Design a protein around this ligand. Structure first.
Ligand SMILES: CN(C)CCOc1ccc([C@@H]2c3ccc(O)cc3CC3(CC3)N2C(=O)c2ccccc2)cc1
Ligand SMILES: CN(C)CCOc1ccc([C@@H]2c3ccc(O)cc3CC3(CC3)N2C(=O)c2ccccc2)cc1
Lengths: 208, 227
């Protein structure tokens, strides 16, 4: 029932805080573990999410959690070319990733996504819609699609309010959604590198 | 340069044929599927060369895009062929498999279930042939663009122009079908979100192929593209 402006306001308010770092992999694992709690707090404030069953809420988070960690990292790193801002006290370039096998490949995918965000001048209002789509789309039922349809309407609203023509609205919408396919691919490659997954019980306890 | 009408027409004429298996036992099934996929790959090359704008790229970039997209294109073709056969995967007209036939190999049933679910999603959306060939062209151009110099920049800018062109073509098809603007935007998003699941399936399918101990080599794809 929310309007597009009210949808945007809710998602912006819900944004998780930036956490700080507490052997490089140990710091990153500890950081991701602490970020998960705040992610679940964010998810509960995504309009429509808590109308789902608790079993379905966990399934969506089980499928989306790493994608959400990555798009958050990519957003944070967007104005630091060639570097990944894991935390304000953990800025790493790709040279540091060469120690572990298979790290630099995922590092490079994340950097290229950050460069893409930079070239499209992605705005914060668009970013929080994108993150909400990952949450609802990744594990997907009728309720989920009309929440997804509402987020789509909100993105179209933001682009028209920004002055884009109808054609540019369609084109930018498509461009943003095609990036989500690459984020899923990065998440899959990231899962493989990590093989680690938050248990159903752990996610359930965090929700309630 | 093409209109949306002309883009649909070109993609429709570029469609590869539906191929058959040999004219049954679970033991021989992997060999049959591997042979079918190997033959389909040859036709997928010639389809790709006919997707508007693809042959404007360098041959190295064409190989990279196909190397990144080939399994996704095989899977979405399988999902399309199966869309009118609930509960079954139509690998070929004479090779129609159900879930129970997919439990012989470990890990096969998980991917089989995912492919069936996508087929059911296509069915629920009443996906049209004209929208399908657009989605397949998007997979080819989008899947490898984020993993590629001045030449690379011009190539990526070209790809995004062609992808913009296909987006307009999808919108035009939806408007021609009488959808409101809101329904056009919502169906466009619904279509492109399915692409994320198709990438997920192909990642899971690629893992399963490496567990048998596999992929079209660079030389092989180059050899086919470079006529
Ligand atoms: C959850 N527990 C149960 C198990 C741990 O899973 C995790 C999850 C995330 C991480 C880490 C991390 C931390 C914070 C962040 O905001 C984002 C990321 C992203 C990234 C890509 C995935 N990562 C890496 O180190 C990395 C690897 C290879 C290339 C580049 C980066 C580490 C471990
Ligand atoms: C190319 N050579 C060099 C290497 C072999 O690569 C391949 C590639 C594809 C295939 C096959 C196949 C054939 C035709 C088709 O149209 C589609 C598919 C799809 C599918 C999912 C991927 N597959 C499977 O068997 C399968 C596995 C688990 C669940 C369901 C299906 C087999 C081998």
């Amino acid at each position: 029932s929310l309007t597009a402006d009210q949808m945007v306001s809710a998602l912006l308010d819900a944004e998780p805080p930036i956490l700080y770092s507490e052997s490089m992999m140990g710091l990153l694992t500890n950081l991701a573990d602490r970020e998960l709690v705040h992610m679940i707090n964010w998810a509960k404030r995504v309009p429509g999410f808590v109308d789902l069953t608790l079993h379905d809420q966990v399934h969506l988070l089980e499928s989306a959690w790493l994608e959400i960690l990555m798009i958050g990292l990519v957003w944070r790193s967007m104005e630091h070319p060639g570097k990944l801002l894991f935390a304000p006290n953990l800025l790493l370039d790709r040279n540091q990733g060469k120690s572990v096998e298979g790290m630099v490949e995922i590092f490079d995918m994340l950097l290229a996504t950050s460069s893409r965000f930079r070239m499209m001048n992605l705005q914060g209002e668009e970013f929080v819609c994108l993150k909400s789509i990952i949450l609802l789309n990744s594990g997907v039922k009728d309720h989920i699609h009309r929440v997804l349809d509402k987020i789509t309407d909100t993105l179209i609203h933001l682009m028209a309010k920004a002055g884009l023509t109808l054609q540019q609205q369609h084109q930018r919408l498509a461009q943003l959604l095609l990036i989500l396919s690459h984020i899923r691919h990065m998440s899959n490659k990231g899962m493989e590198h990590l093989y680690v997954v938050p248990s159903y019980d752990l996610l359930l306890e965090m929700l309630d």
